[PDB]
Subunit: 257 residues, 3 copies
Amino acid sequence: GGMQHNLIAFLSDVGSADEAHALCKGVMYGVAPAATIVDITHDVAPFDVREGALFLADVPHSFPAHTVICATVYPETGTATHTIAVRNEKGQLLVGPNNGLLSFALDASPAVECHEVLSPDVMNQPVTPTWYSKDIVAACAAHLAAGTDLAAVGPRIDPKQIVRLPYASASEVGIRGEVVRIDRAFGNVWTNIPTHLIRLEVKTVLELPFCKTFGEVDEGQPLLYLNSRGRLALGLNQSNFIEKWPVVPGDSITVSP
Amino acid sequence: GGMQHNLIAFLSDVGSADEAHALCKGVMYGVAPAATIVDITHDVAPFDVREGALFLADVPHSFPAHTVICATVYPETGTATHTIAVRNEKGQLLVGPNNGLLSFALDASPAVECHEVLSPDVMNQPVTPTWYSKDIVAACAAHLAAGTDLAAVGPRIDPKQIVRLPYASASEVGIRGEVVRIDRAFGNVWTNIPTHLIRLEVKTVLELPFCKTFGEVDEGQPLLYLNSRGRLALGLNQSNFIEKWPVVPGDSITVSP
Amino acid sequence: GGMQHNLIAFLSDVGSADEAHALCKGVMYGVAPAATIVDITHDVAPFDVREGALFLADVPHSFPAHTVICATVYPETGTATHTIAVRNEKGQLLVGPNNGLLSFALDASPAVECHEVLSPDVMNQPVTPTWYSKDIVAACAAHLAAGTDLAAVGPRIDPKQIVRLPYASASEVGIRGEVVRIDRAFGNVWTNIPTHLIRLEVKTVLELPFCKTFGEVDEGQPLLYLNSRGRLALGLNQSNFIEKWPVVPGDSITVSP
Ligand SMILES: Nc1ncnc2c1ncn2[C@@H]1O[C@H](CCl)[C@@H](O)[C@H]1O
Ligand SMILES: Nc1ncnc2c1ncn2[C@@H]1O[C@H](CCl)[C@@H](O)[C@H]1O
Ligand SMILES: Nc1ncnc2c1ncn2[C@@H]1O[C@H](CCl)[C@@H](O)[C@H]1O
Ligand code: MET
Ligand code: MET
Ligand code: MET
């Protein structure tokens, strides 16, 4: 049966500059009054399922077991692509479109049970075809939060029926990797190079010192370091790296002695 | 007498980029510790009472009955224009400046009882003339949330004494309407044409297919559809419509066979 | 011993455009499930300790006594500069880097007891050198919120060992002052001139009327007024002042009859 998950972790691409995300929400308190709603972010680039998926990766680990991860970038709203409900190995519940959005969250804690959200009893009637995020995803997330059995949302599916996004691995060739994501607020660059395969040379060619933290080099100076995810990163001490060297997600990066 | 409304729905134009909205809030927890504060948005254009009012329209329906709708775009702060407190037909309470801000929220669920907020016992002493939003609107919203009788805020007024913003209707002439609001995050255009009066022709003249949802046309292609509010809308499938055809609120739109 | 502080007031520079601030947070609910987390703001300019400190000034007064003020602009993360935990005269608890961030908050309500956060039992193991904000500041803030004794975080220090940021006073010379902060959302200018030392002349030279509130002058017209903090301010009635006269923090301002 169901279990109370009092904490809803809410992620979308509708922004926080208008009421859309708050309505969702209004709906969620209606179903689950006791729930604590927490925004992950709503400022995922429009339709960008990959970026949303990347933002969700560290969520399962950072959040307690009584969490409903509600992911809501759904450009396929009102079409054949369904919403899915998942229970992971930590015990957390997650709800979102079966479009690859939960890919990296499930890498952190794998799927133990999944179901397609097909039952109207966990939906917000009547369902608007252009707003599945509110009427299906958010509504279902609140029902599971209130303690609804996972089985009641719809029929069981295999974990392989969950759409997964491709993630490129770094390999020893020197080690070649790529830029996965830029830390928007600061301009730091994150790579897919783990601890793990490792003054070094990074290829434009640069000689960068490897540090434990930002303040080990002078203000404005570049550095290499390992982030919280065990991956290699580039930054300027108290400055914006991608304003000096404008890299984009997907670009190659090679590290050699 | 009063009734507990545990959920505060908070809307302003002060943004979320500094502490202003959080102070409000600090004040609200002081009066009502048990209250759950939820932002509708704070990114209403400065002084734009119309935009704020549009953001509030779907709030009464989306939110449960134990909600205090706290609306806070108040360029008339410290002048003769008072704050009002309202109880609607759903049972929800709403507080804001009598400047037209609650207009469209009251269209959704009409006013059953109204009072001007004049009593200092529901205010945050001393009241700063430049911050009525915090010291009167937010403070009063928290008092009503805690269970304060509506009558205690100040003297009763007639619903007609509530300032209302004009809303232009769409009419059959072909059907002529206007652009009411642009969906900032995606670039979708919303019109005032209901379900209801309706490949069609939209006047620059365009031939657009009428769809149930975005993904019924190819990526980048334009479409016509009905939104959650039962009104006609324009969009590009996974793209920004007002970047292709830059329309602004108020502009005419005619739909013919 | 410790006391429950159920309300966490959370301030950072990591923005709300991605998951970073929400992870912090995830961590906080893990330690303190009953806690109510409230964002002050996350849109403090990168590394800008001064701006963050200014945003915190009015927080102690606006917020109740059971608040943990969690301040998190920490460019010195992973270096010798430690996190500190403070209990002020109001009874509130505050946690942040000993880099000047809590300076103006402590001006409002002075430090009664302080400790450096050195114990791992109030931290999030293992601590990432690049994320002290999450693993030390946010974790410790949640522990104190749950009721952990202030003494348990680490060794006691003197209040003078707390780094303080310099604040320039306005003086009678006519009264000379400076621009402290610009009200981002509206364009209003705040000065360091108190009530207190005061149609007036403001030096480019302008003749401005002194008003109680914005609407005492015609739309678009400039005015002088006192803000909620008892300090002199400049603005345009329903317009953006720094778009007409582009002043920056630090610039001189002289007021004479
Ligand atoms: N023009 C558009 N094309 C495709 N999808 C769109 C869209 N506008 C909004 N959405 C998508 O609609 C979802 C609501 Cl269910 C939101 O997540 C948003 O991603
Ligand atoms: N320069 C200005 N002119 C007129 N109104 C202003 C203003 N600055 C802020 N407000 C208005 O002051 C209110 C606080 Cl009570 C906020 O809602 C804001 O809308
Ligand atoms: N490139 C950089 N240089 C110096 N400090 C940086 C930084 N990037 C993030 N931080 C700082 O890291 C803290 C996490 Cl503990 C955040 O508060 C942020 O202020
Ligand atoms: C998210 S705060 C600073 C960014 C950094 N790269 C870290 O180690 O995550
Ligand atoms: C708010 S999500 C997508 C926008 C859309 N027009 C809808 O039907 O509201
Ligand atoms: C923060 S709302 C309007 C700004 C104003 N200067 C006030 O008195 O704080």
